[PDB]
Amino acid sequence: AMDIRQVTETIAMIEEQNFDIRTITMGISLLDCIDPDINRAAEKIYQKITTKAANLVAVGDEIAAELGIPIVNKRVSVTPISLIGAATDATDYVVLAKALDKAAKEIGVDFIGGFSALVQKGYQKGDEILINSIPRALAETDKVCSSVNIGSTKSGINMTAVADMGRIIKETANLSDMGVAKLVVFANAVDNPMAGAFHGVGEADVIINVGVSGPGVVKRALEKVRGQSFDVVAETVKKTAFKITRIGQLVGQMASERLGVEFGIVDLSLAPVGDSVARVLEEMGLETVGTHGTTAALALLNDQVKKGGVMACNQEDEGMIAAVQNGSLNLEKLEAMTAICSDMIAIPEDTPAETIAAMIADEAAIGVINMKTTAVRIIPKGKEGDMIEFAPVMKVNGASSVDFISRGGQIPAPI
Amino acid sequence: AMDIRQVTETIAMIEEQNFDIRTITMGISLLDCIDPDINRAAEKIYQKITTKAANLVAVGDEIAAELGIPIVNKRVSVTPISLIGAATDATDYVVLAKALDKAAKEIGVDFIGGFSALVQKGYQKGDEILINSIPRALAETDKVCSSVNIGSTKSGINMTAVADMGRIIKETANLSDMGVAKLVVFANAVEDNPFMAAFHGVGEADVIINVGVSGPGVVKRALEKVRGQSFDVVAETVKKTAFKITRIGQLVGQMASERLGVEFGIVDLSLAPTDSVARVLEEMGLETVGTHGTTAALALLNDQVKKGGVMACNDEGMIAAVQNGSLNLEKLEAMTAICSDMIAIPEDTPAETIAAMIADEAAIGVINMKTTAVRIIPKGKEGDMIEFTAPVMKVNGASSVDFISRGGQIPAPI
């Protein structure tokens, strides 16, 4: 909601339907906290985050109060810590993760992201000390998340790193319960958010981005067009998405004003606060998520939502688990579905490191060849068909990938 | 390969590795055959193909003889018949298909494709009558291929047509033993295809040659030399083998064109021969195709091939992993995100499931600007062995009926 016409239309919308904010995230630059004395740097990071984001949760709560809608999460993201680490001689960067945990705790946010590295063109100074800090850092902090970007359409895939991330994912899991829940591997990150957020260099010193609701609101809108054609279904997804995005903008403009900070973007559509998605696709007229059709349906959802959102300038899930259990959702369906779209996949604990690497490789390839963002979060804990809690632990193909993953190097290009 | 030095170098290659020419195909426009009397169109068509392709097979043989490399196939491809059907009153265009099958038999090719409709934006005059001829066309011809293109990036997906195409597939299944093997459904069909599976695009030349060349074996032989080395090196190896294989194709296309008196068009991309794509992937170092890593491996293979192509200009392993359960209807489905099937399914499975299965592949290619191609063979039961290939696969039994029932057009995409 920018001029009065748009705010007003937006408040009209907040009346006829029920929307909710998934997150409000503030990104902070930490470049100015660079110090070759890593402890001085730890302190600079701290004062800074606690200053700039001092009011973030209060204001988030006020906004929720005025609009009469809930705000699930309030988060912060930051400059990839490897670049801060890099200015140092430190041999590990956990200490920097701790400045983040203590900042978070103090300002009351749920999570702070960006203990990250970006290693698609190869490891640069900082990258490996960062990545080998991951298992310890994620065990010794509660609110910090990490992400590592390992390929890009423009640089291809750094498989040296994908192989490390297999070993890393496992040391992270055996060193704490829920650490692997805060690590995500990516492709085509290098950006805003996401449980893998970080704040890109050459973004504002401080900005607020918000991501908004979705499924439930879309489910209620499809139910009104049962039996109706694909043309109708699609106009429906787009019009809902256009409103969903407007509310996001209203919340971001408000937030940005009260904090005296620029507003950046709003985005897009997962599922938390007792929401849907698997039900959204099923209401499109499939019987169970995962069956034949499901990938056209989610290509429909995604595409039209994207276009709804562009129409205003922009840019978990019980449905799913039941389908994993009744076995009509399958790991390779999900992989299929990442082709047109896209985490929290559970796999058995004993899964060899190279198998994790190849899952990642599989996912990054799709992302890379198809100019898409991909993001794996693998949890390897448990047995063949258990039930972790923070996920059904899924079937993993038992045929080896060792040789592959031992090769090393860079997969180039694409044409 | 155009200039005589290039010709020499290319001949040089044929001596080190052994190569296949998989197809040589002659594209033929049938617009001058149009005629309100469908019987006359039919004879005009039989005339045109029999003349213009009167030497195709002979020239294929001589060139194979001369270069000493085997030439598997010789085929023909024509104007989509929906266009020809359309200038007519007929209610079905099966008489056009029998024209093609008589022509195809007389010139002695393996197949002739073009009994087709481009229906991405929706049915135009001609298209349904054509589509509805397919079950019958394909029961009563031996050498005709049919294909229907049902969306594209540019126009999104004709979900009416995808639903029909469910019914059609079954109808064709139930009308003959192997009718279904010659029917393909598609997304992003490019007027250039070839590779059969395949039609001659309107505004392409009156007659053209294109050739498809071998691969998997040569690439697999090339990879065995680099066991243990990094992906940088797998990528180079794969690119340079792909260079050569393309040159052979250019040269085989240049001769065919010269002798036939016909322009040369483009050259192709790799596919099951005698060795498998499956073994190639395993050689990159996966224990069984379908396991984790496979879609990255097909990504590398595919990309490097494509770029060895531009640096020149223009089964076994598989079935086996279907059985050890190491390959998956959905895994194949995933791999089509990054590249490019003969899949048999049980025969009782409903039309909506087949359509939803088309709809899924159509979406992969439509949003990714990739070409996609489903040939579903619904015969027999959960586990059989339908050897025209083989085996019958699991199919989700959660209904897709309601989705498929909506009809219409899925738009866009952005």
Side-chain angles (χ1 to χ4, degrees), chain A residues 1-190 193 195-269 271-272 274-312 318-387 391-394 396-414, chain B residues 1-190 194 196-220 222-270 272-274 276-313 316-339 341-385 387 390-393 395-413:
Chain A
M2 222 318 295
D3 63 45
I4 23 307
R5 168 78 154 284
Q6 196 233 293
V7 174
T8 269
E9 235 143 53
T10 294
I11 73 237
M13 289 161 196
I14 63 138
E15 306 196 333
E16 89 256 303
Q17 259 140 320
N18 305 313
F19 302 94
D20 44 282
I21 294 325
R22 207 180 310 292
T23 183
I24 286 189
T25 295
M26 183 187 273
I28 324 329
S29 190
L30 301 174
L31 272 11
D32 65 18
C33 300
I34 288 175
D35 204 291
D37 177 339
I38 201 166
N39 311 286
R40 279 261 49 211
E43 213 16 75
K44 301 166 173 179
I45 282 159
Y46 177 87
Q47 280 303 144
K48 186 165 177 180
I49 287 163
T50 51
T51 304
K52 308 301 215 197
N55 292 282
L56 219 213
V57 199
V59 158
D61 275 336
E62 281 161 30
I63 301 212
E66 299 155 34
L67 273 16
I69 52 168
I71 300 172
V72 181
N73 294 318
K74 298 161 197 45
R75 297 186 184 152
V76 152
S77 66
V78 308
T79 301
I81 287 319
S82 38
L83 298 175
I84 313 291
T88 263
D89 275 348
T91 241
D92 83 76
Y93 303 151
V94 173
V95 54
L96 294 175
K98 317 215 185 182
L100 305 170
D101 217 25
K102 193 182 315 201
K105 275 162 183 178
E106 163 82 36
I107 59 190
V109 294
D110 305 44
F111 278 113
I112 178 160
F115 192 73
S116 311
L118 306 180
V119 298
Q120 338 83 243
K121 332 164 104 196
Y123 286 151
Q124 268 290 157
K125 159 184 222 320
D127 283 338
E128 263 180 279
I129 282 37
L130 183 99
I131 289 184
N132 303 128
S133 297
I134 300 194
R136 228 184 68 115
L138 283 171
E140 293 179 26
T141 55
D142 290 291
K143 293 188 195 241
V144 167
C145 294
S146 167
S147 47
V148 165
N149 185 76
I150 49 80
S152 80
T153 299
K154 172 209 215 198
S155 302
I157 311 161
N158 174 170
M159 295 281 287
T160 289
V162 160
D164 296 311
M165 229 46 57
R167 163 194 64 83
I168 271 105
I169 276 145
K170 297 209 91 173
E171 312 175 4
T172 313
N174 95 107
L175 229 51
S176 60
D177 213 349
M178 92 135 201
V180 276
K182 326 184 264 175
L183 208 213
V184 33
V185 176
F186 279 162
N188 279 332
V190 81
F198 61 84
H199 186 54
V201 195
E203 310 267 321
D205 198 57
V206 157
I207 33 301
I208 273 105
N209 310 286
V210 346
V212 212
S213 64
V217 174
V218 184
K219 201 201 71 275
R220 288 182 285 293
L222 304 165
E223 350 177 6
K224 238 154 265 348
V225 289
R226 292 188 169 112
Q228 230 104 57
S229 89
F230 278 103
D231 315 56
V232 161
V233 162
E235 261 308 319
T236 319
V237 176
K238 175 162 129 64
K239 295 181 276 88
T240 312
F242 163 89
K243 309 190 190 91
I244 284 165
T245 307
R246 280 272 189 272
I247 309 265
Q249 309 177 57
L250 182 44
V251 172
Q253 195 218 253
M254 287 176 264
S256 172
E257 289 160 8
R258 330 262 250 255
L259 271 336
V261 175
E262 304 238 308
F263 159 77
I265 50 75
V266 17
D267 81 7
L268 287 78
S269 145
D275 257 61
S276 295
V277 199
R279 349 283 357 183
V280 170
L281 313 149
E282 285 161 24
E283 164 78 25
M284 272 181 208
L286 307 171
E287 162 171 19
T288 308
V289 64
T291 197
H292 310 281
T294 296
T295 138
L298 172 70
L300 186 27
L301 214 212
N302 181 73
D303 181 72
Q304 291 309 286
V305 163
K306 230 113 119 156
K307 21 176 103 132
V310 162
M311 183 139 300
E318 45 90 24
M320 308 282 228
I321 111 158
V324 189
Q325 279 161 328
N326 68 213
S328 79
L329 226 190
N330 174 349
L331 225 201
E332 30 284 322
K333 199 26 119 157
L334 283 169
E335 174 194 16
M337 315 171 195
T338 77
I340 54 126
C341 203
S342 224
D343 70 358
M344 302 289 319
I345 283 129
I347 67 167
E349 148 166 23
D350 57 297
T351 296
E354 303 74 7
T355 294
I356 300 192
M359 280 172 299
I360 292 166
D362 276 341
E363 271 302 308
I366 297 212
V368 152
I369 72 90
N370 288 131
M371 310 151 73
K372 279 196 179 45
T373 265
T374 46
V376 187
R377 246 218 287 265
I378 286 169
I379 319 289
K381 297 196 166 296
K383 289 169 304 81
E384 219 318 322
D386 292 330
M387 268 309 330
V393 169
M394 282 177 89
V396 125
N397 191 329
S400 192
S401 296
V402 171
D403 263 1
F404 204 71
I405 306 310
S406 314
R407 281 200 200 260
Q410 199 80 24
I411 297 176
Chain B
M2 200 111 81
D3 163 56
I4 358 179
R5 275 97 193 152
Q6 272 95 275
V7 184
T8 292
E9 318 166 290
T10 300
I11 291 173
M13 292 149 191
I14 68 84
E15 81 161 45
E16 262 114 45
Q17 305 103 327
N18 340 311
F19 300 84
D20 227 24
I21 255 54
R22 301 289 170 55
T23 180
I24 286 169
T25 301
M26 170 180 296
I28 308 165
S29 179
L30 307 187
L31 283 25
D32 66 20
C33 300
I34 279 173
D35 192 320
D37 172 357
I38 191 134
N39 297 289
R40 303 203 61 209
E43 147 79 28
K44 291 188 201 153
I45 293 192
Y46 167 96
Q47 268 328 120
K48 189 168 183 184
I49 301 183
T50 45
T51 309
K52 294 266 183 206
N55 280 301
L56 201 220
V57 168
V59 168
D61 289 333
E62 302 155 353
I63 295 177
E66 281 149 53
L67 268 343
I69 82 103
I71 281 160
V72 174
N73 293 312
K74 308 160 248 276
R75 321 228 255 249
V76 168
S77 92
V78 300
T79 312
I81 282 336
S82 51
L83 292 174
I84 309 314
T88 265
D89 253 358
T91 245
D92 76 68
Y93 309 156
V94 171
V95 60
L96 299 185
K98 302 187 191 154
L100 298 180
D101 190 55
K102 296 203 271 140
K105 274 147 204 211
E106 175 58 7
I107 63 182
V109 308
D110 305 71
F111 292 98
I112 178 159
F115 188 83
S116 298
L118 306 193
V119 300
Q120 325 82 247
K121 309 128 128 333
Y123 287 152
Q124 268 313 144
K125 182 171 159 39
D127 297 325
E128 294 170 82
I129 289 166
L130 182 105
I131 315 253
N132 298 107
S133 305
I134 287 159
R136 198 100 141 20
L138 292 180
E140 307 174 0
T141 53
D142 312 307
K143 287 195 157 110
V144 182
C145 303
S146 179
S147 66
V148 176
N149 190 61
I150 47 75
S152 54
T153 302
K154 196 210 258 160
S155 306
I157 314 188
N158 177 169
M159 289 282 307
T160 300
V162 170
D164 283 329
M165 212 56 53
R167 175 257 297 149
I168 272 135
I169 278 148
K170 284 207 99 195
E171 237 139 74
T172 295
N174 46 69
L175 209 58
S176 75
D177 288 330
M178 274 303 264
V180 266
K182 324 185 259 182
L183 208 200
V184 195
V185 176
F186 267 152
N188 281 322
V190 48
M196 192 69 13
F199 64 71
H200 186 51
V202 155
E204 278 298 301
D206 195 70
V207 169
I208 300 199
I209 263 166
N210 307 293
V211 330
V213 231
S214 75
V218 205
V219 175
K220 179 203 46 155
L223 293 174
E224 298 163 13
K225 231 130 303 178
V226 304
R227 288 254 180 54
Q229 322 193 237
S230 78
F231 287 104
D232 305 68
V233 162
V234 174
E236 258 320 78
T237 305
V238 162
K239 191 218 319 185
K240 81 101 195 343
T241 324
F243 180 79
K244 306 164 201 217
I245 294 180
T246 318
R247 281 311 202 208
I248 275 65
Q250 310 182 144
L251 176 65
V252 174
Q254 184 181 301
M255 286 155 212
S257 153
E258 233 99 294
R259 314 241 218 301
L260 273 332
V262 150
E263 291 200 334
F264 171 49
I266 52 84
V267 33
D268 261 349
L269 280 220
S270 94
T274 337
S276 214
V277 173
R279 335 240 80 133
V280 178
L281 303 169
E282 323 190 309
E283 172 66 44
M284 284 177 204
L286 312 184
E287 178 162 346
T288 318
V289 60
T291 199
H292 314 296
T294 295
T295 140
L298 190 67
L300 185 51
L301 187 228
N302 182 68
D303 187 51
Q304 298 292 314
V305 169
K306 196 127 100 262
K307 82 178 70 134
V310 325
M311 175 176 300
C313 193
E316 266 131 346
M318 294 294 184
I319 83 189
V322 186
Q323 283 144 344
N324 50 249
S326 171
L327 245 203
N328 230 9
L329 212 209
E330 24 274 339
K331 197 60 196 177
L332 306 154
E333 199 215 314
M335 303 169 200
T336 65
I338 54 81
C339 228
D341 351 312
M342 277 256 334
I343 59 86
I345 89 251
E347 148 189 299
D348 44 289
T349 95
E352 297 86 8
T353 294
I354 301 195
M357 229 163 282
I358 320 216
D360 283 8
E361 280 285 321
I364 291 324
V366 152
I367 59 75
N368 303 127
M369 354 202 25
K370 248 76 177 35
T371 275
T372 52
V374 192
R375 190 196 282 147
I376 324 256
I377 313 308
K379 313 227 140 205
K381 300 221 266 103
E382 175 95 46
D384 294 26
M385 271 315 146
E387 8 73 333
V392 187
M393 288 180 78
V395 134
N396 206 309
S399 182
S400 301
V401 179
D402 279 333
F403 185 78
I404 294 294
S405 268
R406 302 196 183 264
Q409 193 79 21
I410 289 178

Coordinates of all heavy atoms in Angstrom, one line a residue, chain B residues 92-140:
Chain B
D92 N -12.7 -38.2 -41.2 CA -11.5 -38.9 -40.7 C -10.5 -38.8 -41.8 O -10.9 -38.8 -43.0 CB -11.8 -40.3 -40.2 CG -12.0 -41.3 -41.4 OD1 -11.0 -41.5 -42.2 OD2 -13.1 -41.7 -41.5
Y93 N -9.2 -38.8 -41.5 CA -8.2 -38.7 -42.5 C -7.3 -40.0 -42.6 O -6.1 -39.9 -43.1 CB -7.3 -37.5 -42.2 CG -7.9 -36.3 -41.9 CD1 -7.3 -35.2 -41.1 CD2 -9.1 -36.0 -42.4 CE1 -7.9 -34.0 -40.9 CE2 -9.7 -34.7 -42.2 CZ -9.1 -33.7 -41.4 OH -9.7 -32.5 -41.2
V94 N -7.9 -41.1 -42.3 CA -7.1 -42.4 -42.3 C -6.6 -42.7 -43.7 O -5.6 -43.4 -43.8 CB -7.9 -43.6 -41.9 CG1 -7.0 -44.9 -42.3 CG2 -8.4 -43.6 -40.5
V95 N -7.3 -42.2 -44.8 CA -6.9 -42.5 -46.1 C -5.5 -41.8 -46.5 O -4.7 -42.4 -47.2 CB -8.0 -42.2 -47.1 CG1 -8.4 -40.8 -47.1 CG2 -7.6 -42.5 -48.5
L96 N -5.3 -40.6 -45.9 CA -3.9 -40.0 -45.8 C -2.9 -40.9 -45.2 O -1.7 -41.0 -45.6 CB -4.0 -38.7 -45.1 CG -4.9 -37.8 -45.9 CD1 -5.0 -36.4 -45.3 CD2 -4.7 -37.9 -47.4
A97 N -3.3 -41.6 -44.1 CA -2.2 -42.4 -43.5 C -1.8 -43.6 -44.4 O -0.6 -43.9 -44.5 CB -2.7 -42.8 -42.1
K98 N -2.8 -44.2 -45.0 CA -2.6 -45.3 -45.9 C -1.8 -44.8 -47.2 O -0.9 -45.5 -47.7 CB -3.9 -46.0 -46.3 CG -4.7 -46.6 -45.1 CD -5.9 -47.5 -45.5 CE -6.9 -47.8 -44.3 NZ -8.3 -48.1 -44.8
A99 N -2.0 -43.6 -47.6 CA -1.2 -43.0 -48.7 C 0.3 -43.1 -48.2 O 1.1 -43.6 -48.9 CB -1.6 -41.5 -49.0
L100 N 0.6 -42.6 -47.0 CA 1.9 -42.6 -46.4 C 2.6 -44.0 -46.3 O 3.8 -44.1 -46.6 CB 2.0 -41.9 -45.0 CG 1.6 -40.4 -45.0 CD1 1.7 -39.9 -43.5 CD2 2.6 -39.5 -45.8
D101 N 1.8 -44.9 -45.8 CA 2.2 -46.2 -45.6 C 2.5 -46.9 -47.0 O 3.5 -47.6 -47.2 CB 1.2 -46.9 -44.7 CG 1.6 -48.3 -44.2 OD1 2.6 -48.5 -43.6 OD2 0.8 -49.2 -44.3
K102 N 1.7 -46.6 -48.1 CA 2.0 -47.1 -49.4 C 3.3 -46.5 -49.9 O 4.2 -47.3 -50.4 CB 0.9 -47.0 -50.5 CG -0.3 -48.0 -50.1 CD -1.3 -48.4 -51.4 CE -2.5 -47.4 -51.6 NZ -2.8 -47.1 -53.2
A103 N 3.4 -45.2 -49.9 CA 4.7 -44.5 -50.2 C 5.8 -45.1 -49.4 O 6.8 -45.5 -50.0 CB 4.6 -43.1 -50.0
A104 N 5.7 -45.2 -48.0 CA 6.8 -45.6 -47.3 C 7.3 -47.0 -47.7 O 8.6 -47.1 -47.8 CB 6.5 -45.6 -45.9
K105 N 6.4 -48.0 -47.9 CA 6.7 -49.4 -48.4 C 7.4 -49.4 -49.8 O 8.3 -50.2 -50.0 CB 5.3 -50.2 -48.5 CG 5.0 -51.0 -47.2 CD 3.5 -51.1 -47.0 CE 3.2 -51.3 -45.4 NZ 2.0 -52.1 -45.1
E106 N 6.9 -48.6 -50.8 CA 7.5 -48.5 -52.1 C 8.9 -48.0 -52.1 O 9.7 -48.4 -52.8 CB 6.5 -47.6 -52.9 CG 6.9 -47.1 -54.3 CD 7.2 -48.3 -55.3 OE1 6.9 -49.5 -54.9 OE2 7.6 -48.0 -56.4
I107 N 9.3 -46.9 -51.3 CA 10.6 -46.4 -51.3 C 11.5 -47.2 -50.3 O 12.7 -47.0 -50.2 CB 10.7 -44.9 -50.9 CG1 10.2 -44.7 -49.4 CG2 10.0 -44.0 -51.8 CD1 10.2 -43.3 -49.1
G108 N 10.8 -48.1 -49.6 CA 11.5 -49.0 -48.6 C 12.2 -48.3 -47.4 O 13.3 -48.7 -47.0
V109 N 11.5 -47.3 -46.8 CA 11.9 -46.9 -45.5 C 11.3 -47.6 -44.3 O 10.3 -48.3 -44.5 CB 11.9 -45.4 -45.3 CG1 12.7 -44.7 -46.5 CG2 10.5 -44.9 -45.2
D110 N 11.8 -47.4 -43.1 CA 11.4 -48.0 -41.9 C 10.1 -47.3 -41.5 O 9.1 -47.9 -41.4 CB 12.5 -47.9 -40.8 CG 13.9 -48.4 -41.2 OD1 14.6 -47.8 -42.0 OD2 14.3 -49.5 -40.7
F111 N 10.2 -46.0 -41.3 CA 9.0 -45.2 -40.8 C 8.8 -44.0 -41.6 O 9.6 -43.5 -42.3 CB 9.1 -44.9 -39.4 CG 8.9 -46.1 -38.6 CD1 10.0 -46.7 -38.0 CD2 7.7 -46.7 -38.4 CE1 9.9 -47.9 -37.3 CE2 7.5 -47.9 -37.7 CZ 8.7 -48.5 -37.1
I112 N 7.6 -43.5 -41.5 CA 7.3 -42.2 -42.0 C 6.4 -41.5 -41.0 O 5.3 -42.1 -40.6 CB 6.7 -42.1 -43.3 CG1 6.4 -40.7 -43.7 CG2 5.4 -42.8 -43.3 CD1 6.3 -40.7 -45.3
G113 N 6.8 -40.3 -40.5 CA 6.1 -39.6 -39.4 C 5.6 -38.4 -40.0 O 6.2 -37.9 -41.0
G114 N 4.4 -38.0 -39.5 CA 3.9 -36.7 -39.8 C 2.4 -36.7 -39.7 O 1.7 -35.7 -40.0
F115 N 1.9 -37.8 -39.2 CA 0.4 -37.9 -39.1 C 0.1 -37.2 -37.8 O 0.0 -37.9 -36.7 CB 0.0 -39.4 -39.3 CG -1.4 -39.6 -39.4 CD1 -2.1 -39.4 -40.6 CD2 -2.2 -39.9 -38.2 CE1 -3.5 -39.6 -40.7 CE2 -3.6 -40.1 -38.4 CZ -4.2 -39.9 -39.6
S116 N 0.1 -35.9 -37.8 CA 0.3 -35.1 -36.6 C -0.6 -33.9 -36.4 O -1.3 -33.5 -37.3 CB 1.7 -34.6 -36.6 OG 2.6 -35.7 -36.5
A117 N -0.7 -33.3 -35.2 CA -1.4 -32.1 -35.1 C -0.6 -31.3 -34.1 O -0.1 -31.8 -33.1 CB -2.8 -32.3 -34.6
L118 N -0.5 -30.0 -34.3 CA 0.0 -29.0 -33.4 C -1.1 -28.4 -32.7 O -1.7 -27.5 -33.4 CB 0.8 -28.0 -34.1 CG 1.9 -28.7 -35.0 CD1 3.0 -27.9 -35.6 CD2 2.6 -30.1 -34.4
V119 N -1.5 -28.8 -31.5 CA -2.7 -28.2 -30.9 C -2.4 -27.5 -29.6 O -3.5 -27.3 -28.9 CB -3.8 -29.3 -30.6 CG1 -4.3 -30.0 -31.8 CG2 -3.3 -30.3 -29.5
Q120 N -1.2 -27.0 -29.3 CA -0.9 -26.1 -28.1 C -1.8 -24.9 -27.9 O -2.2 -24.7 -26.8 CB 0.4 -25.4 -28.2 CG 1.5 -26.0 -28.9 CD 1.5 -25.9 -30.4 OE1 1.3 -26.9 -31.1 NE2 1.7 -24.7 -31.0
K121 N -2.2 -24.2 -28.9 CA -3.1 -23.1 -28.7 C -4.5 -23.6 -28.7 O -5.3 -22.8 -28.3 CB -3.1 -22.0 -29.7 CG -1.7 -21.4 -30.0 CD -1.5 -21.4 -31.6 CE -1.0 -20.0 -32.0 NZ -1.6 -18.9 -31.1
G122 N -4.8 -24.8 -29.2 CA -6.2 -25.2 -29.1 C -6.7 -25.6 -30.5 O -6.1 -25.3 -31.5
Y123 N -7.8 -26.3 -30.6 CA -8.1 -27.1 -31.8 C -8.5 -26.1 -33.0 O -9.3 -25.2 -32.8 CB -9.3 -28.0 -31.5 CG -8.9 -29.2 -30.7 CD1 -9.9 -29.8 -29.8 CD2 -7.6 -29.8 -30.7 CE1 -9.6 -30.9 -29.0 CE2 -7.3 -30.9 -29.9 CZ -8.3 -31.5 -29.1 OH -8.1 -32.6 -28.3
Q124 N -7.8 -26.3 -34.1 CA -8.2 -25.5 -35.2 C -8.8 -26.4 -36.2 O -9.0 -27.6 -35.9 CB -6.9 -24.7 -35.6 CG -6.9 -23.3 -34.9 CD -8.3 -22.7 -35.0 OE1 -8.7 -22.0 -34.0 NE2 -9.1 -22.8 -36.2
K125 N -9.2 -25.9 -37.3 CA -9.9 -26.8 -38.3 C -8.9 -27.9 -38.6 O -7.7 -27.7 -38.8 CB -10.3 -26.0 -39.5 CG -11.1 -26.7 -40.6 CD -11.5 -25.7 -41.8 CE -11.8 -26.4 -43.1 NZ -12.5 -27.8 -42.9
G126 N -9.4 -29.2 -38.7 CA -8.5 -30.3 -38.9 C -8.0 -31.1 -37.7 O -7.9 -32.4 -37.9
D127 N -7.7 -30.5 -36.6 CA -7.0 -31.2 -35.5 C -7.8 -32.3 -34.8 O -7.2 -33.3 -34.7 CB -6.7 -30.2 -34.4 CG -5.8 -29.1 -34.9 OD1 -4.8 -29.4 -35.7 OD2 -6.0 -27.9 -34.4
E128 N -9.0 -32.1 -34.4 CA -9.7 -33.2 -33.8 C -9.9 -34.3 -34.8 O -9.8 -35.5 -34.4 CB -11.0 -32.8 -33.2 CG -10.9 -31.9 -32.0 CD -12.2 -31.4 -31.6 OE1 -13.0 -32.1 -30.9 OE2 -12.6 -30.3 -32.1
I129 N -10.3 -34.0 -36.1 CA -10.6 -35.1 -37.0 C -9.4 -35.9 -37.1 O -9.5 -37.2 -37.3 CB -11.1 -34.6 -38.3 CG1 -12.5 -33.9 -38.2 CG2 -11.1 -35.7 -39.4 CD1 -12.8 -33.1 -39.5
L130 N -8.2 -35.3 -37.1 CA -7.0 -35.9 -37.2 C -6.7 -36.8 -35.9 O -6.5 -38.0 -36.0 CB -5.8 -34.9 -37.3 CG -4.7 -35.9 -37.4 CD1 -4.1 -36.0 -38.8 CD2 -3.7 -35.6 -36.4
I131 N -6.7 -36.1 -34.8 CA -6.5 -36.8 -33.5 C -7.4 -38.0 -33.4 O -7.0 -39.1 -33.0 CB -6.8 -35.9 -32.3 CG1 -6.2 -34.5 -32.6 CG2 -6.5 -36.5 -31.1 CD1 -5.0 -34.1 -31.8
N132 N -8.7 -37.9 -33.9 CA -9.6 -39.0 -33.8 C -9.4 -40.1 -34.8 O -9.9 -41.2 -34.5 CB -11.1 -38.6 -33.7 CG -11.4 -37.7 -32.5 OD1 -11.7 -36.6 -32.6 ND2 -11.3 -38.2 -31.3
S133 N -8.7 -39.8 -35.9 CA -8.2 -40.8 -36.8 C -7.1 -41.7 -36.3 O -6.8 -42.7 -36.8 CB -7.8 -40.1 -38.1 OG -8.8 -39.4 -38.6
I134 N -6.4 -41.3 -35.2 CA -5.1 -42.0 -34.8 C -5.3 -43.4 -34.5 O -4.6 -44.3 -35.0 CB -4.4 -41.2 -33.7 CG1 -3.8 -39.9 -34.3 CG2 -3.2 -42.0 -33.2 CD1 -3.4 -38.8 -33.3
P135 N -6.3 -43.7 -33.6 CA -6.4 -45.2 -33.2 C -6.5 -46.1 -34.4 O -5.8 -47.1 -34.5 CB -7.7 -45.2 -32.5 CG -7.8 -43.8 -31.8 CD -7.3 -42.9 -32.9
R136 N -7.3 -45.7 -35.4 CA -7.6 -46.4 -36.6 C -6.4 -46.3 -37.6 O -6.0 -47.3 -38.2 CB -8.9 -45.9 -37.3 CG -9.6 -46.7 -38.4 CD -10.8 -47.5 -37.7 NE -12.1 -47.6 -38.5 CZ -12.2 -47.5 -39.8 NH1 -11.2 -47.3 -40.7 NH2 -13.5 -47.8 -40.4
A137 N -5.9 -45.1 -37.8 CA -4.8 -44.9 -38.7 C -3.7 -45.9 -38.3 O -3.2 -46.7 -39.1 CB -4.3 -43.5 -38.5
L138 N -3.4 -45.8 -37.0 CA -2.3 -46.6 -36.5 C -2.6 -48.1 -36.4 O -1.7 -48.9 -36.5 CB -1.7 -46.1 -35.2 CG -1.0 -44.8 -35.2 CD1 -0.5 -44.5 -33.8 CD2 0.2 -44.7 -36.2
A139 N -3.9 -48.5 -36.2 CA -4.2 -50.0 -36.4 C -4.0 -50.6 -37.9 O -3.6 -51.7 -38.0 CB -5.6 -50.4 -36.0
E140 N -4.3 -49.8 -38.9 CA -4.3 -50.3 -40.2 C -3.2 -49.8 -41.1 O -3.3 -49.8 -42.3 CB -5.6 -49.8 -40.8 CG -6.8 -50.1 -40.0 CD -8.2 -49.5 -40.5 OE1 -8.2 -48.7 -41.5 OE2 -9.2 -49.9 -39.7

